[model samples]
Target: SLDRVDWPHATFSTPVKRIFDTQTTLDFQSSLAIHRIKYHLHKYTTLISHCSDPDPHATASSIAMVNGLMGVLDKLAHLIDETPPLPGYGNLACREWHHKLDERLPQWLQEMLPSEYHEVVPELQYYLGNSFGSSTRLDYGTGHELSFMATVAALDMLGMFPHHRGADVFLLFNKYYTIMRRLILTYTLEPAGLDDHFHLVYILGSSQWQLLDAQAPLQPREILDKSLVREYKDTNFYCQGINFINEVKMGPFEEHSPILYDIAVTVPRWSKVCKGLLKMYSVEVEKKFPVVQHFWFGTGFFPWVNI
Candidate 1:
C-alpha cells in the first residue's frame, strides 16, 4: 500500500488550482533540462568507462580519456560561470578558478614551443604536468571540487524555487545538515573530545544565514512564514540570488578554509548524488520560480533580472 506524503501547501493570492497548473508546466520544462544534462553525463561516463584501456594502447586511450575528462570539466566550469550565483552567496570559488584558467592557460601555452613533442607528447601528461602539477593545487582542486559542487548548487536552486526565489539557500542548508551528520557519524565513534563535539555545532551553525537570526534558530514553520517568503520573493527580484549564494558559501568553504570533513576524497562523489537528486526535484519546482518571475515581469509587477 502506498502511504500518503503530506506535502505542505502554500496559500498565495492566486487560486490554488491555477497556481498548481502553472507550476506543473514550469516543472516539466525544468525537468527537461535536468534530464538532458543527466543523459549527457551518463553517456559520456559510459563511453569513458568502457572504451578506456591501459595496455600498449594505454597512451592513446589515456590521452583520449584525459581529453574527454577535461572537456567535461570545461563544460562544467562554463556552466558554473554562466549560471547566476545563489542569492546570498556570490559566485563560488569555482568561477574564480575558471577565470584564472582563462587568464593563465593562454599565456602559458603561448610561451611553449609548438614543436616540443615529448614535453607535450600525451595530452594527459600535459594536463597533469602543466595544470594539476603546479603549486596552485588549492585553486585547481577547488575548481575541480566545485565543478561537482555547482551541479548540486543548480539542483538546490531548483528545489527551493517553488517556495522562494532563494532555492539554493535551502539546498545549501540541507547539504550542510547532511555533511554535519556524516562528520558526526565518522568521528564520534568512541569517547569524543570536547573540541570535536563542539566542532560539529560550529560547522553546521555557520552555514545558515545570519539575516534570519533575528528569528533565531529557525524551525521549518518559521522559515516558511508567508511574510518571510514574500520578502525573499521580492528581494531576490532577479533569479540571481542562487548565484550570489554560491559565491558566498563556496568562497569560505573552498578558497579559505574548507571544513575538515568536506576535504575527504569521497566528498565529491557524495555531492554528485546530491546534485542528481536535487536536479530531479528541480524539474518539479522550476515551473513555479521561472513562471512566477516571468509573470511578474510581464505584468510590470517586477523588473526582470538580466541573464
Candidate 2:
C-alpha cells in the first residue's frame, strides 16, 4: 500500500537552508544562548511594562532576545513548510485545506482582533500562513514545535516575572502544557467529555515531572552499602531502571544520588523536556486530526516510527 503511492517532491530552497543552518548553530550554543536570551527577555519585559519608553539599552536587549527567539521559531516553521507531504500518509489534501482556511481566517480574525479585517490580517498572517503548503504535516515535527512552545513560555515568563516575582517558572511553564491539553481535548478528543483535571493528573503531571526529573542522571544507579556494584541482580536491575518514568525508593533500603544542578542545568533540561513534549504532542495531534491522516496517506510516506 505504501509503495504504490506517489509522494510529492519539493526542493529545499535557500531560505530553508538558512533556517536549518540557524538551527544547527543554535543547537550548538543552545545552553548559553537560551539562558542569555531568557534572562534578557525577562528583564526587558519587566522594565518596559514599568517604563513605557525604557532605556534604549534595556529596550534593545529585550527586543534582541524576543526577536532572536522568534527568529528560531520562524526558521523551524519554514523548515517544516518546505518538507513535501508524503502521499501515502493520507495528508495530501493539507495544502488545499490550509489555503481555504487561510482565506477565511482573515475575516474571522478581524472580528476577533481589535482592528479592522484588512489591518488585522497582516499582523496575524504569520500564524495562519501555510508555508508548508502540501507537506504541512511535516511541520508537525517535535524539533520545530517544542522550540516554539519553549520560546512562548520564555516570553510569557518574561512578561509576568519581576512584577510578579517569586512566581515559579516551572509552574508557569506547565501552563503551556495545560493550554496544550485543552487544545487537544477540544479539537481532537471532542465529545469525549474528558476533564482537564483528569488529563492534568494522569498525563500532564507525569509528563512534566518526568521531563524535569529525567535530567538527574545519564546513567543512574543505586548506591547500595557504598559499593559501586550491588550483589542482587534484581537490585541492580531496579537501580538501573529507576528513572523518572517509574517510582524509585529513596530511603535507606535503596540510597540514591541525583546530579547536582549546575549552570547548564536549566537550558539542557528545558530544551530536552520541551523537545520531548513537542514530539509527544505531535504524535497525539497526528493520531487525532482526521484530515491530517488523509494528507499523510495521500503523500505515500509511511508513518514515522519513533526511534
lDDT per residue (tens digit) for residues 1-307 in model 2: 2111121241111111211233443342333323432344343223222221112122112333344333333333333234334443324434544555555555654443333223323423432232222234422322322233233332333232323321122232223333333322222221111121111111222222233344432222222233332322121212222221122234433222222112123334433433443344334432233212222100011211111
lDDT of 1 by residue, 1-307 (tens): 0111111221112111112355444443433233433342332222222211112112111223223333433433443335333322122443444455555443443332233221221222223222221122222221222223223322222221232212222233233333323322322211111121122122222223223323423322232233443433222211122222233234432343333223222323322422333343334223334322212111011112121
The global Cα lDDT (0 to 1) of model 2 is 0.29
For every model shown, what is its TM-score relative to the native structure? 0.21, 0.29
After the best TM-score superposition of candidate 1, give how far the Cα of residue 154 lies from its true spot, in angstroms: 17
RMSD of 2: 17.9
What local lDDT does model 1 show for residue 180?
29
On TM-score, the leading prediction is 2
Clashes of each: 20, 23
